[PDB]
Symmetry: none
Subunit: 93 residues, 5 copies
Amino acid sequence: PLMVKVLDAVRGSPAINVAVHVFRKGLTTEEEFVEGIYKVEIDTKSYWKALGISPFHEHAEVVFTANDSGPRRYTIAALLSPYSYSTTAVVTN
Amino acid sequence: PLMVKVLDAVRGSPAINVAVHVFRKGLTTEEEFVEGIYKVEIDTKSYWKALGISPFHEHAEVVFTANDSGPRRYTIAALLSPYSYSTTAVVTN
Amino acid sequence: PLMVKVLDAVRGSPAINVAVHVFRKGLTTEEEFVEGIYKVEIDTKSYWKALGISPFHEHAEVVFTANDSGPRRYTIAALLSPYSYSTTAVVTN
Amino acid sequence: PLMVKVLDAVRGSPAINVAVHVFRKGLTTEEEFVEGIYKVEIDTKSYWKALGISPFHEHAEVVFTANDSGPRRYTIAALLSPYSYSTTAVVTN
Amino acid sequence: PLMVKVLDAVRGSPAINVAVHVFRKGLTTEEEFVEGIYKVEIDTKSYWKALGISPFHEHAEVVFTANDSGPRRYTIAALLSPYSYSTTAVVTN
């Protein structure tokens, strides 16, 4: 037998985030997985990845430059954060 | 036997996010997976990926430049955040 | 037998984050895993990864430069933080 | 037998973070794992990783430079910190 | 038999962080592990890792330079710190 009980009875008004997982049993390889159920990515960067099998093999002249700059703003009040009977505000005077 | 019970009885007015998964049993390879059920991507960048098998193999002259700049703003009040009986506001005076 | 009981009875209005996992049994390899259920990535950078099998094999001339700069701001009030009967605010006078 | 009971009865309005895991039984290899259930990454950097099998094998001339600079600010009030019947604020006069 | 009871009865409004784990039984290798359940990484850097099998094997000329500098500020009020019936504030006059 295998029984899983989550949140059988609720009487009020809650704020919930539920994730239930029950299991019974060349260059990049991934198999038989679960990735990023409740996931947040903000300002994620990747430049070079898995270029090939034989890149720049013979007499390569490469100049690599990466500039991250400038005015960038990120304002968040609640992130993966449930609330109940509260007050949430973002004010920019 | 295999029984899974989630949120059998609800009496109020809640705010819920539910995700239930039950399982019974060349360059980039992925197989038999679950990816990004509740997923948020904001300002995600990727420049070079999986260029080929033999890229720039012989006598390549490459100049790579990546500039991230400028005025960019991201304002979010609630992200993956359920609420009940509350107040949410974004004000820009 | 295998029984798992989580949050059987609730009488108020709470704020919850629930994650339940029950299990019964070339270059980068990953198999049979669970990754990043409740995960937040902010300003994550990766430049070179898994370039290939034979990159820059013979007589390579490479100039690598990585500049991180500029005015960048990240303001967050609640991150993976549920609340109930409270006050949350982000104010920029 | 195997019984696990977590948070059977709740009478108030709490703020909770729950994670329950029950188990019954070339270059980088990982297998049969759980990684990053409640995980926060802020300003994480990686430059070179898993370049290949034979990179820069013969007569390589490499100039590597990594500059981290500039005005960058990160302001967070609550991180992985649930609260109840409280006051949370971020004020920038 | 194997019984585990955590937080059977709650009468007030607390702030909790719960993590329960019950178990019954080329270059970098990891297997059968649990890593980073409640984990925070701020300003974590890694430059070179797992370059390959035979990197820079013959007559390599390498100049490595790593500069960490610039005005960077990190301000956090509560980190992995739940609170109840309190006051939390970050003020920048």
